[PDB]
Design a binder for this molecule. Structure first.
Ligand SMILES: Nc1nc2c(ncn2[C@@H]2O[C@H](COP(=O)(O)OP(=O)(O)NP(=O)(O)O)[C@@H](O)[C@H]2O)c(=O)[nH]1
Ligand SMILES: Nc1nc2c(ncn2[C@@H]2O[C@H](COP(=O)(O)OP(=O)(O)NP(=O)(O)O)[C@@H](O)[C@H]2O)c(=O)[nH]1
Ligand SMILES: *CCC(=O)Nc1ccc(S(=O)(=O)N2CCCC2)c(OC)c1
Ligand SMILES: *CCC(=O)Nc1ccc(S(=O)(=O)N2CCCC2)c(OC)c1
Ligand SMILES: [Mg+2]
Ligand SMILES: [Mg+2]
Lengths: 212, 214
């Protein structure tokens, strides 16, 4: 009925932080460290999406994120050229930040935005209110990011729940066009579009870094 | 053991600091020659807010207003390197961001988040409070683990040296602790300002000298 920040919950968060300082200390020395961050209302599937992508697995039981967490995955990035071209493959080491969407964690999660080079914004195709909130999330991103106009990839998630969709695809494609951000309908249950969405953000983050 | 979550008012406070930090950071990523960041940490009540306030504005306030999670102050200064046999180089423009962390446990993971941003640390205990000095070992251990640098520069501050009637930390003990860890030590007063600028300038030097090597 009345819940408080338990000691176990804070122990959890401190170990995410210890692990992070560990990861960063080592990188001061595989061949590029690309970080991005997933955000969106609680229950849209941020954790599920990252898990499907790192491990190809899905757990249908809701285990809400205690503040903050992150996964990693070593991948190969090949610079995609114009009209189907690619380029050479340098090794990319991803750090995938995963934030709690609950308000009680808003200030803890908001301080990690500056660690990100790009953002995976998620709403639930079955929850119109999570879609309405995409606007508020985008301005919080502009207001706390590194970079004046940060790279974003919008995901409407739970596309496998067709008989419960309430956000019409047109409303979502139009919102995305309004802001100039790539849009993908995803499903963490079966993996649809998960790899393409993230690979699209990686491409945005690597192409932006080759204009300096 | 029942740490309240942040209230709506506590959280608006912290988001404003985050809003101010991002505006400051975005302006430096594009005037002043370097942005330099310190972070003050230590138990609640040792005088972290008061120390930074004395340093930026030469003022001191007796009423205890405990820090809501996190805050920071700024100061423009001129650092001059120290060369061989006092060969003081050109005056460099330094913009200092001075992070101020709350010391209560209920804020511990929030404030630990910000050890990433620091290039150095001001570690405070209270001279009138032996328990706050005994915890200095844990704090250093924490800093070792969460600093983003290996062997982070620390300056130890034993504060409230103006309350001489109420002093309980023996001087030899703290000099021992500081020598054991190889870190500079200053007894300070946020009230009358004794040693505040010397300790903060010592930390600036460590970081600047640390920066030149690279
Ligand atoms: N059918 C279906 N269920 C999904 C999908 N993605 C997530 N879920 C389910 O939705 C619930 C919430 O997912 P989860 O990743 O925990 O959500 P979250 O966005 O991380 N929430 P929080 O911010 O609280 O950590 C879980 O029951 C999960 O099984 C999806 O693509 N399809
Ligand atoms: N005499 C004297 N009093 C001091 C000194 N430094 C702080 N105080 C007083 O002792 C209390 C400590 O206040 P403060 O600076 O807020 O401590 P803090 O470490 O930032 N506390 P918190 O972590 O809870 O935010 C206040 O009442 C302050 O006025 C000092 O050097 N001398
Ligand atoms: C402009 C989009 C963006 O956020 N770019 C970006 C590039 C590089 C980094 S970093 O982590 O390698 N680094 C920290 C300070 C400068 C170099 C970041 O950090 C998030 C963002
Ligand atoms: C090793 C001592 C130390 O902490 N040095 C240091 C120098 C510069 C920076 S930074 O703020 O310019 N930066 C953050 C991301 C990489 C570049 C930092 O980081 C706090 C530390
Ligand atoms: Mg989650
Ligand atoms: Mg304070």
């Amino acid at each position: 009925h009345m819940s408080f920040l338990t000691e176990e919950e804070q122990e959890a968060i401190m170990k995410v932080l210890q692990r992070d300082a560990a990861l960063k200390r080592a990188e001061e020395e595989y061949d590029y460290l690309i970080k991005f961050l997933a955000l969106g209302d609680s229950g849209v599937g941020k954790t599920s999406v990252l898990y499907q992508y790192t491990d190809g697995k899905f757990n249908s039981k809701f285990i809400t994120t205690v503040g903050i967490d992150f996964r990693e995955k070593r991948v190969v990035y090949r610079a995609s050229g114009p009209d189907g071209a690619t380029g050479r493959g340098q090794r990319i080491h991803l750090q995938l930040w995963d934030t709690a969407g609950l308000e009680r964690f808003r200030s803890l999660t908001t301080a990690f935005f500056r660690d990100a080079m790009g953002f995976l914004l998620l709403f639930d195709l079955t929850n119109e209110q999570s879609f309405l909130n995409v606007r508020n999330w985008i301005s919080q991103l502009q207001m706390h990011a590194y970079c004046e106009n940060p790279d974003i990839v919008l995901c409407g998630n739970k596309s496998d729940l067709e008989d419960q969709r309430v956000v019409k695809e047109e409303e979502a494609i139009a919102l995305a066009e309004k802001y100039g951000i790539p849009y993908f309908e995803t499903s963490a249950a079966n993996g649809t579009n998960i790899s393409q969405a993230i690979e699209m953000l990686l491409d945005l983050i690597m192409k932006r870094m080759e204009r300096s």
